[PDB]
Amino acid sequence: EVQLVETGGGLVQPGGSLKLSCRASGYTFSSFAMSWVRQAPGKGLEWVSLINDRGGLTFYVDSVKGRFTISRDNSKNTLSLQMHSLRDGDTAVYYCATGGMSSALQSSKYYFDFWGQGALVTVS
Amino acid sequence: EVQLVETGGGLVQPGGSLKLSCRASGYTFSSFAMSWVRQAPGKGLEWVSLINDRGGLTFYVDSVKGRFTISRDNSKNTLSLQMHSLRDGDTAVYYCATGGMSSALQSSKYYFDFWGQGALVTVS
Amino acid sequence: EVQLVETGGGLVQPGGSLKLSCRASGYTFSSFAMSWVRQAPGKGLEWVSLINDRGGLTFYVDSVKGRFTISRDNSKNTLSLQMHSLRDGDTAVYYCATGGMSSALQSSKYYFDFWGQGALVTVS
Amino acid sequence: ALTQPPSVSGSPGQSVTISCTGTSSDIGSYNYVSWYQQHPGKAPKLMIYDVTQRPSGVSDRFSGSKSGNTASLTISGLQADDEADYYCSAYAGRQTFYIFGGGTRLTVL
Amino acid sequence: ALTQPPSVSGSPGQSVTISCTGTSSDIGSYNYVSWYQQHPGKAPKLMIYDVTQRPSGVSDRFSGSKSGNTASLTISGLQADDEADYYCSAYAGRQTFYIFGGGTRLTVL
Amino acid sequence: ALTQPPSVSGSPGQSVTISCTGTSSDIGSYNYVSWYQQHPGKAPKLMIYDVTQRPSGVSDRFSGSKSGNTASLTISGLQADDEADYYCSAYAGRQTFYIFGGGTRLTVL
Amino acid sequence: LGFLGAAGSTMGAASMTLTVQARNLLSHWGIKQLQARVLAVEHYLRDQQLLGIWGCSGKLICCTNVPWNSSWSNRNLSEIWDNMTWLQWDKEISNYTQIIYGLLEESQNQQEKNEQDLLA
Amino acid sequence: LGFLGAAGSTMGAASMTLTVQARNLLSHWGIKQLQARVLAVEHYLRDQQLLGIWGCSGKLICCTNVPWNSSWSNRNLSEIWDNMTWLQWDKEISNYTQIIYGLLEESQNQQEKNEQDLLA
Amino acid sequence: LGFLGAAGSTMGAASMTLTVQARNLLSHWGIKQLQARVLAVEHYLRDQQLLGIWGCSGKLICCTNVPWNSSWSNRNLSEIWDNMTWLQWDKEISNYTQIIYGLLEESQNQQEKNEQDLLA
Ligand SMILES: *[C@@H]1O[C@H](CO[C@@H]2O[C@@H](C)[C@@H](O)[C@@H](O)[C@@H]2O)[C@@H](O)[C@H](O)[C@H]1NC(C)=O
Ligand SMILES: *[C@@H]1O[C@H](CO[C@@H]2O[C@@H](C)[C@@H](O)[C@@H](O)[C@@H]2O)[C@@H](O)[C@H](O)[C@H]1NC(C)=O
Ligand SMILES: *[C@@H]1O[C@H](CO[C@@H]2O[C@@H](C)[C@@H](O)[C@@H](O)[C@@H]2O)[C@@H](O)[C@H](O)[C@H]1NC(C)=O
Ligand SMILES: *[C@@H]1O[C@H](CO[C@@H]2O[C@@H](C)[C@@H](O)[C@@H](O)[C@@H]2O)[C@@H](O)[C@H](O)[C@H]1NC(C)=O
Ligand SMILES: *[C@@H]1O[C@H](CO[C@@H]2O[C@@H](C)[C@@H](O)[C@@H](O)[C@@H]2O)[C@@H](O)[C@H](O)[C@H]1NC(C)=O
Ligand SMILES: *[C@@H]1O[C@H](CO[C@@H]2O[C@@H](C)[C@@H](O)[C@@H](O)[C@@H]2O)[C@@H](O)[C@H](O)[C@H]1NC(C)=O
Ligand SMILES: *[C@@H]1O[C@H](CO)[C@@H](O)[C@H](O)[C@H]1NC(C)=O
Ligand SMILES: *[C@@H]1O[C@H](CO)[C@@H](O)[C@H](O)[C@H]1NC(C)=O
Ligand SMILES: *[C@@H]1O[C@H](CO)[C@@H](O)[C@H](O)[C@H]1NC(C)=O
Ligand SMILES: *[C@@H]1O[C@H](CO)[C@@H](O)[C@H](O)[C@H]1NC(C)=O
Ligand SMILES: *[C@@H]1O[C@H](CO)[C@@H](O)[C@H](O)[C@H]1NC(C)=O
Ligand SMILES: *[C@@H]1O[C@H](CO)[C@@H](O)[C@H](O)[C@H]1NC(C)=O
Ligand SMILES: *[C@@H]1O[C@H](CO)[C@@H](O)[C@H](O)[C@H]1NC(C)=O
Ligand SMILES: *[C@@H]1O[C@H](CO)[C@@H](O)[C@H](O)[C@H]1NC(C)=O
Ligand SMILES: *[C@@H]1O[C@H](CO)[C@@H](O)[C@H](O)[C@H]1NC(C)=O
Question: Which of C101, D89, I13, I56 is 20 to 30 A distant from C70 in Cα terms?
């Protein structure tokens, strides 16, 4: 069984910063690209960021492009997101998900296979 | 005498598709770039698309860029245009014209030397 | 002592042209990048253009990008600016300044070290 | 980004269809449309991917399809436990990687 | 895109000038301005190209010129048969290849 | 482009601070903030560069600093002769090379 | 981690050691030794010329505009990159390398002409 | 369609066979044969070095920033590409190739320095 | 202005004569002369191969993504480019060139894989 567990933060003031992290188990971490998907309390899902299985390539939605950093540690099976300047509009559940990309020598993805349960980030 | 004869379609419903074709004679077809120029019933001329003499390079006006395909067959002396999603705004006479580009080892063009008489495309 | 002396023009009609020039002394002219900085009669400073110490690379503010040319003569220690189409909005004091860029094998600049006194260009 | 209807419904045993209409440089350009099932309070589950495929672990009552710029999810032998917010998403190029529709609150009557 | 006047006119034997004013990243950047003659009901004919050249097959009564961002067509020994819609066009770069003005309905009095 | 206050003031011997607030793809991205002193009627003089450095030829009463997207100029042993319009500027990338704030008319009381 | 150490590994693993092998391609009695050295240089240059012809000069991994024909091999990516070592792969498609090389040359010839006419 | 088959054709036709000729540049008794082989390699490498110096490494058709002087040849494009074969052209401008080669080198030297300072 | 004329000049001056030196790298009794010629070619090709491995094929000045360690040299740009000739510089960092070369290779290997996955 594949498990993704978010162990990130909670309440932060506007203009501050908050770091999320996600621990992975049950699969080879290093074989998959990962992403963060956000859900505002009253909304649907929004893609926020994507990182390569080797950690070299990162992509962002324009609304967080100059503010968020997505990273990876393949020795510790950890995915992370460092958020800065935290707007009120960034309040959401942030889900750790596996998928969104492949490495050219692999069959493609372009969908999300596994999901964590999500950290709730509140900006007040 | 150079002749370009459009043998395309007529009336099509909005959101449908229509293909135009133009038969060429009287010159070496393969030596010239070709284009389509459009004229709405009450308007002047508008450039729509351009294709290379070898058929490898195509250019479009932004308003049709994701909807029209310009092609070429140098064995059959045929120029063609495949139009999709046909907006009401696409009603016009479509003229087959020779010119608009050269191949670097040739003197330049940047004008249209020969014109066909035009197919009338109606979107209702 | 480093001196930059503007010997440019004055009053010009809208839509005309005016050339500025600046003579440099007291330093190796060819070792420094140079720029033009503009000051409208009631405003602060605005960067207009930048040229490389070898004269090969030029940069412009968008508002003059298709209208002004910045040049250089390293034999005559002369910086120049050719302005065309001169809008009323181009009335300003134009200062000759040393700085704004370096050549990769040099310590960086990104500031302006020396200033001339400025030519007043009036568009009426 | 993508448009899908609210409140699709039907009785147990009846099929339902949840549509998803996008644009040309989206659904119309790439065959990478996926569907997710979110029960309130839970993370979304993948149901469909690459327009028509389903992952191991889900039933064959869920089937995807598309035409033009519209994709859809068909649920056949509808069960009470299918109540969920269903979402579509699609790959939309290397500039705007993923887009989603709003959720469809499927109600079983 | 390009501006040229409507209703240029004159009597037989009088010259007329049809102007065409564009922009800097257009007429002001490239010497590729051409003129076409369209009689109502017919496809356009090339009259002038590369600002000043004329193709074989047309008369020397038609002469092009330009200055700054403005191009023009001069017709000298005006004839009744010159009535037509005259159009200017220009190459305007590799992003927006060709642009045209509206037609000038030249009337011979 | 950059925001700095008008009319910063204080009496001789008192320090003053002139702030400069920019954006993230500006002050927040590059440590290339400079300050210039312009007495009315004269060309600007460089006082500070690279946020904290001063050129030979100026006093040590002038000291720069920054945090986040805000840069500032501190003047310590304020003198009557410090009256001037002080300007901040910053390198803001290879597309929009330099930007400036408005001037701060420092008044010594 | 040395020369040909990856020979028994999977294609997707062995592809990470390309510089290990590339660097080991270059360095009357005594004449046959000169013939061997001259020949080694000529062999090297022919492979480099061929990469240049295909538009792959200066790189160890080169993507092209030539599609794969499944008549050449109908195996998927997991079969090829996560099994079949390079020695196994080479045997399987040996019959098709001249067809593929010809198609790489034809493609580059169209690319260079389309790029000169866009710079015109 | 073989080596030098296009020698009698027009420059604009012959320019489409560049890979045909490029591939035929590479491959005490027996010593003079080694000298011939070593020399062929040295010749090849000098032409390749020269293309690299001019910024044309890895390609058969290379556009530059060097303008044509009509003092070198005042013929137009139809005279040059639709007549004068390459053998004829080579004779006509033989007197100018060293001037042109020098100007290609000078241009590349300015280009590489302008590009390093834009990456700074 | 000839070969090695800039040897006594500053690094920032000598860097403008790179084509002068590059062009002087290429061109039983008589056998030792063939050995010298074959060896000169092999040396040349190894340096060219190495530039290709680092992603510098075809150029005389190549910028990389390898940062400078001040443990290698802690001199600033005015000390290095406006003094220390290239002969002096070569002596000072001779102990570190293998570390630097290894780091240039490792970087290029990551760059080529990141670029193939962005073309996918
Ligand atoms: C793919 O190949 C198909 C069959 O080609 C033939 O079989 C292969 C194994 C080779 O021996 C080849 O020389 C033979 O012609 C083609 O029919 C098909 O069109 C090819 N696909 C392409 C090129 O689009
Ligand atoms: C990749 O292929 C795997 C093996 O497929 C089977 O065995 C090979 C040797 C052929 O005979 C083939 O026709 C057989 O179906 C599959 O198990 C695997 O699911 C495939 N992966 C994907 C993404 O399609
Ligand atoms: C073009 O050449 C003109 C004449 O140059 C001279 O004649 C040619 C045939 C060569 O023999 C050359 O060495 C001679 O100097 C120049 O006057 C003219 O400036 C050149 N055009 C350029 C370089 O802009
Ligand atoms: C290209 O040149 C053709 C030939 O021009 C004439 O003959 C050559 C050999 C020279 O002596 C030249 O001075 C002569 O005028 C022209 O017929 C043809 O029109 C020209 N093409 C273009 C586009 O200008
Ligand atoms: C920079 O180098 C530091 C010391 O590295 C050691 O000393 C140098 C001179 C070499 O002999 C090297 O082999 C030794 O390991 C490192 O501690 C430091 O992390 C290096 N900086 C990097 C790579 O970020
Ligand atoms: C560049 O370095 C110059 C010399 O610095 C001094 O001498 C060298 C040999 C070392 O011992 C160093 O630690 C000494 O401080 C400075 O004079 C010059 O200002 C420096 N330039 C810049 C821009 O920092
Ligand atoms: C040889 O195969 C084993 C699995 O049986 C694998 O763990 C090992 O890494 C392989 N050796 C090489 C060089 O790849
Ligand atoms: C070998 O091939 C199969 C597909 O045929 C694939 O599932 C597997 O990843 C490959 N490698 C291994 C680890 O057996
Ligand atoms: C390759 O060619 C041989 C004949 O030379 C043939 O027997 C074999 O089936 C072919 N197929 C392969 C191994 O791809
Ligand atoms: C030789 O000239 C004739 C015309 O006289 C032409 O048709 C033929 O193609 C030419 N031969 C070659 C190799 O170009
Ligand atoms: C030869 O040159 C003339 C121009 O001088 C040109 O018109 C013709 O195209 C060229 N080739 C032929 C086919 O004669
Ligand atoms: C080329 O040089 C020779 C002298 O070497 C001269 O006679 C001839 O006129 C020159 N012109 C040509 C053929 O370009
Ligand atoms: C040698 O040093 C002097 C300064 O003493 C300098 O002017 C000259 O250019 C230098 N020579 C070379 C080849 O750089
Ligand atoms: C030599 O080094 C110093 C810095 O140490 C620098 O100021 C100078 O420009 C360099 N060259 C000269 C001209 O002495
Ligand atoms: C270089 O290495 C030698 C020992 O081989 C050592 O003595 C010297 O201090 C080192 N440092 C230099 C010159 O960079």
Answer: I13
Under 8 Å between Cβ of F21 and F3: yes
How far CA D81 is from CA of C107, D41, D71, E37, H63, in Å, comes to 68, 15, 23, 72, 67
Residues 6+ apart with CB under 8 A from G79: none
- 8 Å CB contact of I37 and H34: no
Coil/strand/helix, residue G9: coil
CB contact (8 A) between residue H118 and residue C57: yes
Tell me the residue ranges of DSSP E strands in chain F. 9-10, 16-21, 33-38, 45-48, 62-67, 70-75, 84-91, 98-100, 104-108
Q: Which of F50, F98, F101 lies closest to C100 in CB terms?
A: F98
Touching chains H and B? (3+ Cβ pairs < 8 A): yes
Run of H or E residues at I111: helix I97-116
Nearest partner of G58 among C23, I115, C25, E29, judged by Cα:
I115
Residue ranges per structural domain of chain H: 1-120
- With touching defined as 3 or more inter-chain CB pairs under 8 Å, the answer for chains H and D is no
How many helices and strands in chain D, by DSSP H and E? Answer: 0, 9
Three-state SS annotation for I32-45: HHHHHHHHHHHHHH
**Shortest-distance ligand to the CA of residue H10:** 10
Q: How many helices (H) and strands (E) does chain H have?
A: 6, 0
**Hey, which of H1, H3, H9 would you mutate to test ligand 10's pocket, going by the most ligand atoms within 8 Å of its Cβ?**
H9
The end-to-end CA distance of chain G, in Å, is 49
CATH superfamily to which A3-123 belongs: Immunoglobulins (2.60.40.10)
| Rounded-to-integer distance, Cα A32 and Cα A52, Å | 7
Give the C-alpha separation, A78 to G60, whole Å: 32
On chain F, the residues whose CB falls within 8 A of the CB of C65 are none
Ligand 1 pocket, Cβ-based, cut-off 6 angstroms: G 69, 71, 99
Nearest residue, CB atoms, B110 vs list E32, E44, E101 = E32
Preferred mutation among D97, D99, D105, D106 to probe A, highest tally of A CBs within 10 A: D97
CA gap F77, I88 in Å, rounded: 48
**Under 8 Å between Cβ of D108 and D9:** yes
- In single-letter form, the type of residue at position I97 comes to T
Kind of pairing, strands D70-75 and D62-67? Answer: antiparallel
d(CA D73, CA D86): 9
Q: Amino acid identity of G32? A: K
Token pair listed for D5: 């209807």
CB contact under 8 A, G31 and I31: yes
Q: What three-state secondary structure class fits E69?
A: coil
**Distance from the alpha carbon of residue A76 to the mean position of ligand 8, in angstroms:** 26
Q: Are C89 and C46 in contact (CB under 8 A)?
A: no
DSSP 8-state code for residue I67:
P
Q: Taking a contact as any Cβ pair under 8 Å apart, which residues of chain B between 40 and 79 contact chain D?
A: 66-67
Here the tokens at position B6 are 């459009």
B104 vs G114: CB contact, 8 Å cut-off? no
Any H CB within 8 A of G117 CB = no
* Cross-chain residue pair G120–B103, CB shorter than 8 Å: yes
Q: Domain residues of chain A, as ranges?
A: 3-123
Amino acid at F7: S
Scanning every residue of chain E, which has its alpha carbon at the shortest distance from the alpha carbon of B113?
E46
Handedness of CA H15, H16, H20, H23 (dihedral sign): positive
β-sheet bridge partners, residue A22 = A6, A79
The neighbour count for residue E12, using CB atoms within 10 Å, is: 12
Best to test chain A binding among F24, F25, F26 (most A CBs inside 10 Å): F24
- Asked whether the beta carbons of B30 and B53 are under 8 A apart, the reply is yes
Q: Say how far residue A9 (Cα) sits from the centre of its chain.
A: 13
**I69 DSSP assignment:** P
Let me know: does A102 contact A35? Beta carbons within 8 Å: no
